[PDB]
């Protein structure tokens, strides 16, 4: 089976919740690894959260200094949906501080860069085994996805950006097939900002829905055939979409500069002109997640919008969010059915402790009845250590 | 293969014990959920325990407060029977705090409540994937069976209630064939009160054995067939099943009055006019476990039986208690097995604890040699926390 | 794949360390069950550990008191071999304080038994699910093999007792067929006793040897054909195999009654007139282990014996043995391999902690190079409780 | 499928990181096993981490005096690439404290020697039956790898030394089908030294680098067929292998007396008369690691060379490496790809802590971009015990 990645998004009405793995709250027990920048990717068969681990456990002197990005002992590691991620229940991928992972339908890719700021290597394999490398080409933290790459048809692709993290860097798309790259392009996108992309598969296409760090409080998007011509732009709504970001009004097709600088990774979902937003409730903290129906979203600049389902309240921690889709293969549907994962940041720099570490949830979009509420970590900070 | 649910339940003259789980003795020391609503169910090739958890382990601060029945954090898992239900053995199913499952031959039907009081939503999920949703239609605390769902010649049937704990509520039988619902219906039952339902298979149709939570100390019944054309009623026995309730005297088909308030889950396996009713020992607490045949029990009101058989002694906690089958697939029998499943619940409120958990003991029917004991949970509390 | 037990015992020359699970030291920190009665089982494909738990994992409170040998949270459960037995790594088997497990080559027969002092019953399952039971005949202790049953031509065969201890009891020896007694005899045994038999397959009948816990210091055995046609006597050898017992001296091919009372479960493999004798190498206490070969030690009761192979050295404790086989099927050799198993029990009695469990060691019989030395349990006693 | 180990290495350029397990970190909470010697091995379908326990876990008092080297406790056991060693999720292979594993593209070999240093015996399973076994021809502590042994055309072959550490010693080369040895020959090999080999095959042929723990601070090797006739030399670069050793300088052919006397297991590649050599930074101690490409260092005794990769820091303790391969019918590649790890000791006898351990990191050759960089083990010492 390779993945077609032909069909287009599902018609769909709400959000369902799919998973919860209580991370945290279990890990305060149990022997659960510190993780931060989590997501979900399928292939044909089955469901696995991917996540990277700090080397070390939560509840433990290891844990101290986990705000911290990037080492050598962070990994990419995996476990099944739903389960806290320990070393007895999860799978090693690779040596990352950054990654991304997809299945094309005969074996899973994963990407993971280590190694200094000044030179990054993403190793690249298929089924376990390397198949290529990728070295910085600007010398200034190789950096990936952390979410899933989108497969169409046999290849899979992803966005990787070098450069810094407060101005214009430099972005780069890559075709992969069975873990080689076969072809790459460099965005031509001056004044553009391409960070963490969320980027799905749909009608023999891909669309990335990204973070802009530098100057924009609206996010990003680039989209391209499986030929890598591109278009790019920014999702036009003013039902602003990243963190920290101003109060929702007029947006742009271009990056809305106040509140620009700094962001969150987060996802959107085009159906036609409109679009499903994924954003914090918070417009100054990782506070919060709610989901938001704009009809006319995607091309048009007012803040109005029509459906709004809450996923967790204002008062309670959230963080990174990403897409992820179920092929039909999987499903048995006749649609690509859209998802997203939510994690949940407990700890530094908000938190009192000596470390940082994230939970999950995860939601898939359906034609049916469903409700909003508030599904948060739930964790009772500080830990014995 | 579809499981065919067209044999008549095995001739039986007692239970021979099947699992044992010390799960709670086990989590004095071990990683072990918090959980509580356990339940066997099985596939034509294994049996497994499904369980919602706490989103917490025992013998740690998150613990605390797990008394309570409905949270976000609580999520409906499974392992292999007889194990301890742990972080590091346990598939996650589903969010919940009400639950049902079965398995119709093919894949693996969850269906997980979650949400708001005044307006969940129960995620069906077939094979993991969603498959359907239910919101709730009276928009009060929507809940299912915490047992088996029961399959006949591919489709699955379960009831679900919504509406007062203490009054009239509504209760709704449904149909469901790979993980959608194709029909429903409503029982017309005014002054009858149904909640978590042991329902099994049998020649074809269906026969459910219930919880009258506002005046019965009786238990209600509703069978059914594949058309959902149903028969309601209550068991007739003054041998009483539920609990609370008075001590046996004269039965009554209708709810008998007499402590019908409260109750706890239950079952009862019908033959012919006569019943095998699992109850309590005690007639006002959830202690003792026994199993009485009342050869007409099912439709004469004397409180007269013939054979009890002893499970857990009055002196130790017990729990809810249900049914599960092991269909001729699986067993190479040409009758529908009949098992029962017993919680002993530790903690709150019987406890003074911070917290409430659940272990497990499970039986089989047999037509051989068995034996009266007491298999009781036997941990020592309170843990270290 | 039907085993065929058809095949005669393999030349040997001496006992090559099979595996050594370190179960007690890895229990002073990991989650490692509470157990005692370890025997291993092999099908046509894997070996297996079988072991009876108490319901309760080691340093911590629930192993209080456990030099008890029955109670109602003991379990038959099962690890690979070598593994410590962990909730984490252990499958379920049945409820049961006495047990016997083998596999017939085409699935797995387990027997548990269960219940009161006065009235237990064994509960078998073919495959997990239950297939017979067999209720206790004398009213006092029924009681197995704790070790394999043996398995010739799609037939498993094992035996049981009921009555005193210390007096002349009843031995039965039942022939099962996938799980379900077919036949069964009762041993014309005045003045013998048998207790916990070490069972092997060899030619197309069964040789058991025993314990005599009565007035014997030399063991019983008994062998039978596929119709139970059987035949008993004692090991004839001066070599005694029991513990306690006199030290080495004229034998008796009925029981020696010089510290006859009391004894260990053990084994012997016979060869022509000749035996393998496991025994412990203290007199009087369940200390070190060793094998013997003594050339004419089955019908001869001379106490000349030719080789000595130290196990266990005598300042270390040991505890139960028994044999296992590991079938032409399994190891691709054209005759039946024996190897046996040790329990190396720690706690109570003989050392001053509130727990009492067991690690263990096994061999195989080999026709190449071996060597004698100690490998003992190594664990440091007591633990933090 | 056997694998025919004809083909020819890779040609490469540097080295990507394929794992880091962060084993020692992880053990300061979790149940993870105090190991030495560990070492990755693969068939056809996947890669395993091999490692010698001291039956016994870490932040636990059996963790005490396990700078022993042997002892009756050590087991060999393996666990998936990257993953903590666990209790919880290894698989046991042998008792012993000197070991080797390969796979011929059927089935694994596991060697494991245990018994007293005067007469030791290594015990062979092959798919994890015993299959034969080598006594102790010296009577001086048989020994064997610590690493993989190498396949080529259904027969695997392997080193082993028996005699002094410190002075002239006895080595084999063993031929071993289906866990047989077939064929042997002792090395005529008088003033070479040779342990613990880094044995890969290469053109139908297998080459071993090893440790001359006499006199010798340049790496011995010997190459031979599949009939056993060998070729023997030292590496001849001036970048000389051991630890300790002299600064580079003027290298030999034979053994380099300077700093001779001890040592450490490591590995080299030889390319045509080029070789890459693994080695630690420090002179003195078993500090740092760097991959060091000599074009001519096979064959020449000038210091010079051309490429230096870093893997660990000077200031962060390394330990043993070793070569694996991973042969085309794993990769799909036409060449044999070249791989290595390298143990991380941390304790004693460089660290005053009561236990030693290990973890380990691990790289692929590839002909694509790399860095270097340092990956240490990043543990806290010491624990709580
Ligand atoms: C333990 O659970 C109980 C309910 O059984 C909670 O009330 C406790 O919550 C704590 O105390 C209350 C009064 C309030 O201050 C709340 O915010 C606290 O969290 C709970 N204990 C803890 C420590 O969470
Ligand atoms: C910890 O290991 C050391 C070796 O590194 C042992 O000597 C200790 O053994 C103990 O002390 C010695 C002197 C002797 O009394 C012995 O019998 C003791 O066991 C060991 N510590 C412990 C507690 O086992
Ligand atoms: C590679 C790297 O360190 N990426 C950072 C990321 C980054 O700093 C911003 O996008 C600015 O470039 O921000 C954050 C963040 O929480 O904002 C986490 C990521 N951490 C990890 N992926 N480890
Ligand atoms: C959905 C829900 O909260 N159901 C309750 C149930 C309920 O309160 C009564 O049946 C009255 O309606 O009672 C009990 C109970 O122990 O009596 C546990 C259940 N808890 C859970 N399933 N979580
Ligand atoms: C069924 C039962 O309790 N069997 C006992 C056994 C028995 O007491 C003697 O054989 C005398 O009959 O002795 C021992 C023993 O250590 O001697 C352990 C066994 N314990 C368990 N199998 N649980
Ligand atoms: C069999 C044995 O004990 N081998 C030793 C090895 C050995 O002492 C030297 O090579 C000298 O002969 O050295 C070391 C070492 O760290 O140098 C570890 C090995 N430990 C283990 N394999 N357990
Ligand atoms: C914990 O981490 C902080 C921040 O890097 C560091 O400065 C501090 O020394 C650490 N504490 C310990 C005990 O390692
Ligand atoms: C431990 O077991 C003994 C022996 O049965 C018992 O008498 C004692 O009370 C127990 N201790 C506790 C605290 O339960
Ligand atoms: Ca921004
Ligand atoms: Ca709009
Ligand atoms: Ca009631
Ligand atoms: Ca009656
Ligand atoms: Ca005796
Ligand atoms: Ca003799
Ligand atoms: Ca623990
Ligand atoms: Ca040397
Ligand atoms: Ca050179």
Redesign the interface.
């Known amino acids: 089976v390779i993945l077609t990645g032909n069909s287009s998004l599902c018609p769909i009405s709400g959000w369902?919740?799919?998973?919860?793995?209580?991370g945290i709250?279990?890990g305060?027990?149990?022997?659960?690894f510190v993780i931060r920048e989590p997501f979900i990717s399928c292939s044909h068969l089955?469901?696995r959260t991917f996540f990277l681990?700090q080397?070390?456990?939560?509840?433990?002197?290891?844990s101290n200094g986990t705000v911290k990005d990037r080492?050598?002992?962070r990994?990419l590691?995996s476990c099944?949906?739903?389960?806290?991620p320990?070393?007895?229940?999860?799978?090693?991928?690779?040596?990352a501080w950054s990654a991304s992972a997809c299945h094309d339908g005969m074996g899973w890719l994963t990407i993971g860069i280590?190694?200094?700021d000044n030179?990054?290597?993403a190793?690249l394999k298929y089924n376990?085994?390397?198949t290529?490398?990728?070295?910085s080409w600007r010398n200034n933290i190789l950096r990936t996805q952390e979410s899933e790459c989108a497969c169409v048809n046999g290849s899979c692709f992803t966005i990787m950006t070098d450069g810094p993290s407060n101005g214009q860097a430099s972005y780069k798309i890559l075709k992969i097939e069975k873990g080689k790259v076969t072809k790459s392009i460099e965005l031509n996108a001056p004044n553009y900002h391409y960070e963490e992309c969320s980027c799905y598969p749909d009608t023999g296409k891909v669309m990335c829905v990204c973070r802009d760090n530098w100057h924009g409080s609206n996010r990003p998007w680039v989209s391209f055939d499986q030929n890598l011509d591109y278009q790019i732009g920014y999702i036009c709504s003013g039902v602003f979409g990243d963190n920290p970001r101003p109060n929702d009004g007029t947006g742009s097709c271009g990056p809305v500069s106040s509140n620009g600088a700094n962001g969150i990774k987060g996802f959107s979902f085009r159906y036609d002109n409109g679009v499903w937003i994924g954003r914090t409730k918070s417009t100054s903290s990782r506070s919060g997640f709610e989901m938001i129906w704009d009809p006319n979203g995607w091309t048009e600049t007012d803040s109005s919008f029509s459906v709004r389902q809450d996923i967790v309240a204002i008062t309670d921690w959230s963080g990174y969010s990403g897409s992820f889709v179920?092929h039909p293969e999987?499903?048995?549907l006749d649609c690509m059915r859209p998802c997203f994962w939510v994690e949940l940041i407990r700890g530094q720099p908000k938190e009192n402790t000596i470390w940082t570490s994230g939970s999950s949830?995860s939601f898939?979009g359906?034609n049916?009845?469903?409700?909003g509420?508030?599904?948060?970590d739930?964790?009772?900070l500080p830990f014995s250590i």
């Open positions: 369902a919740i799919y998973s919860k793995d209580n709250r279990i305060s027990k149990g022997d659960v089955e469901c681990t080397g070390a456990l939560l509840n433990d002197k290891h080492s050598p002992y990994t590691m099944p949906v739903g389960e806290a320990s070393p007895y229940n999860s799978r090693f991928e690779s040596v280590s190694g200094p030179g990054a290597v190793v376990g085994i390397i290529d490398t990728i070295k179920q999987l499903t048995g949830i898939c359906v049916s009845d469903t409700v509420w508030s599904w948060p739930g964790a009772e």
